[model samples]
Target: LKCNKLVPIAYKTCPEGKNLCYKMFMMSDLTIPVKRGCIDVCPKNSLLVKYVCCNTDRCN
Candidate 1:
């Protein structure tokens, strides 16, 4: 996929057995420290992460 400037260079998922690296997340794998767009778009509640991006004054 054509990653934008906001998209991270890479990411890692928990439950190593889940095999995230080998499989694409529908189109592209999620980047580490997901951007606000990702958390807003994720339909499933199962794609859990300890953190997410928010309130970084991007709208200024």
Candidate 2:
């Protein structure tokens, strides 16, 4: 789905009962350009990318 301007929710399965936001962007030569807007979902598994999860606000 297109994220548009929606806040991305980060977590596995789904958040039990808390509000969360997600951010997604790309990297080049191990350097990130800038932070993007709110995203709706976490990134997928890939050999070229890495995804992480945390149990607190703004932790992804």
Candidate 3:
């Protein structure tokens, strides 16, 4: 579960009740691959940063 380059590491747990996993898709015009990790609050879709959230393990 190496999330993203900004914070490359395996994710397992979360604080309080903020347990969730997400996959940040790469930009349409970029070469980087999709990123996945644990998250407390999944982000919304953007013109440059599209993503998806899942609850299962390694569901990214």
Candidate 4:
């Protein structure tokens, strides 16, 4: 996917028998829409976004 300036491309791979890295978050104001990008690790106060990554592939 083409990442925009707001959403940076995040990349990460989990260890064997581990879950893939999935993350999502919005600003405190919640005025900004949900951005797209990849993150190395999951963030707090946020839930994971579906289809952001695939278990079979390294990058998504």
Candidate 5:
């Protein structure tokens, strides 16, 4: 799926045995762009950034 509006949208397959899709948002800057990927797990959220993980494809 798409990572952010500023970047080219591309579809990628997840790593072996991994089904979670990761997404991140910035609280400080809305135009900074969000992050997305099919990774093993989501990172811990912080004061300036929020992380999310989803079970379905394109959920991010």
Candidate 6:
């Protein structure tokens, strides 16, 4: 799915609701050049990139 102008939503909604607004499958927060739009919608700003989980068990 192409996240064109997509607005990230809280993960709390993802598990219970199929909301596409959250780009959980798209770009990651831990990546450089963080998307301001995503940051605006994330509840706790807790999403992380794949590299961020190398030693951690949590994304928040």
TM-scores of the candidates are: 0.18, 0.30, 0.56, 0.26, 0.65, 0.15
Q: How many backbone clashes does candidate 3 have?
A: 0
Q: Highest lDDT, which number?
A: 5
lDDT of model 6 at position 40: 26
- Which residues of candidate 3, in runs, are more than 4 Å off? 1-17, 29-32
List the global CA lDDT of all models: 0.28, 0.38, 0.60, 0.40, 0.64, 0.27
Of the two candidates 1 and 3, the one with more favorable lDDT, higher being better, is 3
For all predictions, the C-alpha RMSD in Å is: 13.5, 8.5, 4.2, 7.5, 3.6, 12.1
Q: After superposition, how far is residue 14 of candidate 4 from its true place, in Å?
A: 14
lDDT of prediction 3: 0.60
lDDT of 3 at 15: 39
**lDDT (tens digit, per residue) of candidate 3 on 1-60:** 322323444445543554676767667634553665667787888887787777666454
TM-score of 5: 0.65
**Candidate 5, residue 49: lDDT:** 82
In terms of TM-score, which candidate is strongest? 5
Tens-digit per-residue lDDT, 1-60, candidate 1: 112223344332323222111112321334433332323222333344333323222210
lDDT of 4 by residue, 1-60 (tens): 222223334434445444544433355535443543444454455343332433343333
Residues forming the 10-long window of minimal summed lDDT in candidate 3: 1-10
lDDT of 5: 0.64
Consecutive 10-residue window with the lowest summed lDDT within model 6: 51-60
lDDT of 3 at 58: 44
- The candidate with the higher lDDT, 5 or 6, is 5
Residues 1-60 of candidate 6: C-alpha lDDT, one tens digit per residue: 122232333322222232233333325433433331222233433435221111111122
* Model 4 misplaced stretches (Cα beyond 4 Å): 1-33, 46-60
* lDDT for each residue of candidate 5 in 24-44, tens digit (9 for 90 to 100): 779966555477666676679
lDDT, residue 6, candidate 4: 39
